[PDB]
Structure formats: C-alpha cells, structure tokens
Amino acid sequence: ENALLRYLLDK
Amino acid sequence: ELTPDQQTLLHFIMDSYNKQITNKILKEEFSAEENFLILTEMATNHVQVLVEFTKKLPGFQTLDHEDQIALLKGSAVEAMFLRSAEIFNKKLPSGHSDLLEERIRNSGISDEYITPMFSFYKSIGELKMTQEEYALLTAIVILSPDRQYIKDREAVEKLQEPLLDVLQKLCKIHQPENPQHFACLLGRLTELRTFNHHHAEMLMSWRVNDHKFTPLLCEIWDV
Ligand SMILES: COCCOC(=O)c1c(C)nc(C)c(C(=O)OC/C=C/c2ccccc2)c1-c1cccc([N+](=O)[O-])c1
After folding, report:
1. Is B46 one of the annotated binding-site residues?
2. CB within 8 Å: B65 and A6
3. Where does the record place the modification Phosphothreonine (chain B)?
4. Contacts of A11 in chain B (CB under 8 A)
5. Domain holding B31: CATH number?
6. Minimal CB count within 10 Å: which of B4, B92, B132, B212?
7. Distance between CA atoms of residues B188 and B166, nearest Å
C-alpha cells in the first residue's frame, strides 16, 4: 500500500 | 567552530529546512468537530513537508523501502508538534499565540490533551532554540532507530549518530556556559513521544464520529 508515500519519496 | 565534513552536513539540512496555515483559527472565530476541515488541512500541510524533508536527509534514500515508510508513519505526529512549536514561539507576532491558545481551549478538544500541548510548547519556548537546533532535532526525530516494524535497526542508527554529534558540538559553542543544554534538547525528543498516545486516542474518537480525512492522512495513519 502506501502508494502515495512511495510516490512522494521516489521522485 | 566545527569539522570540515560536519559543517557541510549542518549547512545542508538547514537549507533543506528553510524551504519545505494558522490564521483561520484566529478569525472566522472557530473551535471544532464542526470546523474539522481546518485541522486535517493543517495536518496535511504538516505531512507534505515532513515527506519533502525526509527525502533530503542524508542516507535516508539508501534505506529499505519499508523501513523508510515506518520512519515516516512513525514520526508524523512528533514532527507535526515539533514544527508547531517553532511556529508558536519563534514565528508569530505578539498576541497571536495568546488568541490561538484560547481559541483552542474553546475547541471542545479536552485539556487532558490541550494542557500537555501548551506546557510542552512553553517549555521548549523557554529553551530559546535556534533554527539549526530545530532543524537538526527534527531530523533526529525522523531517524529514530526504535520505531515499530523496523527490520534493520542498525542501519538507522549510523544515520542518526552523525546528526547527534553535530548537535552536541553545536550547543557546546553556541550555548557555551550551559553544558546541560544539549541534554535538555534531547529530553524534548522524549517529551514528544507521549503525543502519539494522545493521537491514537483522539484519532479513535474521530472515527466513532465518522470524520473525513484527506487521502494523505489516510495513508500515514491507517484509517
Ligand atoms: C496532548 O497530546 C495530544 C496533543 O496533540 C493532539 O491532540 C493532536 C492529534 C492527536 N491529532 C492531530 C491531528 C492534532 C492536530 O491537528 O494539531 C496539533 C497542533 C495544534 C496547533 C494548531 C495550530 C497552531 C499551533 C498548534 C493534535 C491537536 C491537539 C490539540 C489541539 C489541536 N489543534 O486543533 O490545534 C490539535
């Protein structure tokens, strides 16, 4: 999950 | 002042901190379950800046991806508080903090939770902290080795350790004549831990009133 956290971190 | 490699590190969190709100509580006048939208908006502003700082932290990106998450989810509340204290004491003109507290006491959010919040803010206010202290300390909170569901604890220490050695030496020279000051600052990390308990408890009450939370808050807090 934590799809949005992953996105915001992987940038 | 400070070591070659340490000066570069210090001079990099700090710029990171400089570059990624309250006044609606100050006027349309309001305390709230009815105004709950204001809260989540604020928390959400907090969570977004938390994330953008944590990326910039040295070696953070090199950690396991699940450990990465645990540190974030582990640190949202503490950082939300520690940042509010820098807003409350360091940045607001005279009179604003006073109305703010009183507006909040009117929130229908009970002192069991309110009084610790304000005593914590005063205590740290009275500590008269610089931006470097607030920044570095923020980064120490985030890199807390002991958070739950961490797989490789030893990787996170080794990442916090360097930040701690900067801060000791920093206090040593710019609160010379106060060798206890560095311990005082660390006690604030201890102090912050308690707010998670309160969070949990407050969060649980808001689900029983079926409150709406933003996407982001949904993820960071498992609602
Ligand atoms: C004592 O331990 C628990 C204290 O922490 C929490 O209760 C707590 C929890 C558990 N979840 C959340 C989402 C919040 C939160 O939104 O913000 C804390 C910031 C307060 C504040 C706001 C503006 C300027 C300066 C400070 C707080 C909370 C608490 C009280 C009052 C308020 N507030 O409406 O401002 C919020």
Report:
1. no
2. yes
3. 194
4. 55
5. 1.10.565.10
6. B4
7. 17
Q: Are B63 and B156 in contact (CB under 8 A)?
A: yes
Q: How was this structure determined?
A: X-ray
Specify the number of domains making up chain B. 1
Long-range contacts of A3-9 (CB under 8 A, 24+ apart): A3/B219, A4/B215, A4/B216, A4/B219, A5/B51, A5/B69, A5/B72, A5/B73, A5/B219, A5/B220, A6/B65, A6/B69, A8/B48, A8/B51, A8/B52, A8/B55, A9/B51, A9/B54, A9/B55, A9/B61, A9/B68, A9/B72
Shortest-distance Cα residue to atom 1 of ligand 1? B113
Q: Whose CA is nearest to atom 23 of ligand 1?
A: B22
- Show the domain range for B144: 1-223
Interface residue of B45, B47, B65 to substitute, partner A, most A CBs within 10 Å: B65
